[PDB]
Structures are given as structure tokens and as C-alpha cells.
Ligand binder design. Structure first.
Ligand SMILES: C[N+](C)(C)CCO
Ligand SMILES: C[N+](C)(C)CCO
Ligand SMILES: C[N+](C)(C)CCO
Ligand SMILES: C[N+](C)(C)CCO
Ligand SMILES: C[N+](C)(C)CCO
Ligand SMILES: C[N+](C)(C)CCO
Ligand SMILES: C[N+](C)(C)CCO
Ligand SMILES: C[N+](C)(C)CCO
Lengths: 133, 127
């Protein structure tokens, strides 16, 4: 936290203390373990120490990705040169789902662990039940 | 008594739904008090069977209630979105036990022998 000469402190704004970003509410306390869709329309999240999230974060048993300046991203993002799909709506990594290509031609499959499958092996049964491996 | 209000009513053997004014509903969905959706055509007859409403397809049971999920028609399955009740097509739907997927074709019919072509970058195309 910061306190000025007049004794006032920052309220409802972002502040970078010693090279780390934090957010203080309209009461002067920093958000901790909390989201906030900033005035800039981007979503942010702060952990136990109130530090602004960067990169991947497991939040409430789900995974989100944050750019280097704090905003949550959606769509495809590569990590360890392998792709992941983040729900364009809610923002959490998808898994075991068929996400349709951008050229409407087809689909991209993401395995139960979230990693895109670029060697998907299909197995169909008599009634047509697809089973992906 | 002589002025039907907020109630369904069978007239000339046909179901109609009466709004608060005593006028039939016409070209309107109307989630009833039983948790089901109902549609009435231009005459105000209660929808039954299949109905292409706003270029989207729907299926209602012989009682008027709109169906969702897997409905079998002419020994060929079709899947109805549990969300808005419309007919899914060229999409994959999870099997009821989360063990696999079923593919619904452009025309809406379940494919029993879908063929897959996996391109270099992993992209999948269905036929
Ligand atoms: C952060 N990752 C998306 C790479 C892990 C979830 O599997
Ligand atoms: C909190 N901000 C996103 C405005 C700073 C990072 O550049
Ligand atoms: C939808 N989000 C995951 C971005 C946060 C809402 O609290
Ligand atoms: C999709 N269904 C499982 C209902 C058809 C195969 O029996
Ligand atoms: C399934 N129908 C034959 C009733 C029409 C929708 O394509
Ligand atoms: C079959 N309906 C539900 C439309 C009649 C009940 O009054
Ligand atoms: C989902 N329904 C189409 C049944 C409601 C009207 O929007
Ligand atoms: C990121 N994409 C899924 C669009 C490329 C496939 O490798």
C-alpha cells in the first residue's frame, strides 16, 4: 500500500508498487483473489498477494491466460509451442471439444487435457458413435 | 365463462391459446405454466410435429410441448438443442455418457458412418 504526505491513499485505481501491479478498491484496499473487468473493458485477476495475474492461472479449478500487461485473452494461444483454446465468452481453456475452424471448412479438436490434437485418431461404431483418441 | 382468458381451449377439435384480452395468440411462442414451449401458427392453431419457424426447425409432441434432445423421425435420428430447441446441424454432440461424440450432418441427420480427413495442422473435416 501507499500513503501520501496528506495521509490519503490510492482508491479505485491501478498502481505499480516496486515493479508489481495491484489494484486498490474505492476503499483503499487491494483486490486479492478477485476478478475485475476494468474500465478498459479487459478482465483482470489478482491473487492472494493482490498481484495482477500474468500468463496462465488456475482460478477456481479452471485455466485462464493473461497477456504481459494483465488482460485476459481468448481464442487460440500457444504455450510450449502447443495450442490451447480459451472460451471466447467466459475465457477458460476448453478441453475435449470440437472448435470449428475460422474458414468454416472444418474443426480443430482439443484433447481432455486442453492440448490441440493434430494427429486425432477416429473410431466410429455401428450406430455412428465417434470416439476420439 | 363466456370470455376465455389466459387459458388453452380446444375449439372445433383444435387447440388455441387465449391471451388476457380474449384474443387467440398468433405467431407467438408462449412458455406455458407447465415449463414447456408452445407455438401457434397464423391461424393460432397449436403446433404439433415438425414446424419450420423463422427458417429454423422445431419438433413438438402430439400434446403441443416442444421437444429437445434426440428425437427419432422416420427411423433416422435428429438432435434438438436443449437450449433454444432448434435443430442442430454440422455439429458434434456429446454422447449421453460423455464417452464419445455423434455427428449431425448439414441436413440435420445423424451420420452413422462419418468419414474423417485430418489435414497437416490437425484440422478435421467431416463428410
Ligand atoms: C497452462 N496450461 C494450459 C498449459 C495447462 C492446462 O493443461
Ligand atoms: C494495469 N495496466 C494494464 C493499465 C498496466 C499494464 O500495462
Ligand atoms: C467470466 N470471467 C471468467 C472473465 C470472470 C467473471 O467473474
Ligand atoms: C444419438 N443416439 C444415441 C440417440 C443414437 C444412437 O442410438
Ligand atoms: C425432418 N423433416 C423431414 C421433418 C424436415 C427438417 O429437415
Ligand atoms: C395439450 N394442452 C397442454 C395444449 C392442453 C391443456 O389444456
Ligand atoms: C427458445 N424458444 C424459441 C422456444 C423461445 C423463443 O425465443
Ligand atoms: C491455431 N490453429 C488451430 C488455427 C492452427 C492449427 O495448427
Amino acid at each position: 500500500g501507499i500513503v501520501h504526505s496528506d495521509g490519503s491513499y490510492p482508491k479505485d485505481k491501478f498502481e505499480k508498487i516496486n515493479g508489481t501491479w495491484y489494484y486498490f478498491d474505492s476503499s483503499g484496499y487491494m483486490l486479492a483473489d478477485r476478478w475485475r473487468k476494468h474500465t478498459d473493458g479487459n478482465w483482470y485477476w489478482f491473487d492472494n498477494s493482490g498481484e495482477m495475474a500474468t500468463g496462465w492461472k488456475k482460478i477456481a479449478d479452471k485455466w485462464y491466460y493473461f497477456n504481459e500487461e494483465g488482460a485476459m485473452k481468448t481464442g487460440w494461444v500457444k504455450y510450449k509451442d502447443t495450442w490451447y483454446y480459451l472460451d471466447a465468452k467466459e475465457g477458460a481453456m476448453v478441453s475435449n471439444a470440437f472448435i470449428q475452424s475460422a474458414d468454416g471448412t472444418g474443426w480443430y479438436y482439443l484433447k481432455p487435457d486442453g492440448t490441440l490434437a493434430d494427429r486425432p485418431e477416429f473410431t466410429v461404431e455401428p450406430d455412428g458413435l465417434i470416439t476420439v483418441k
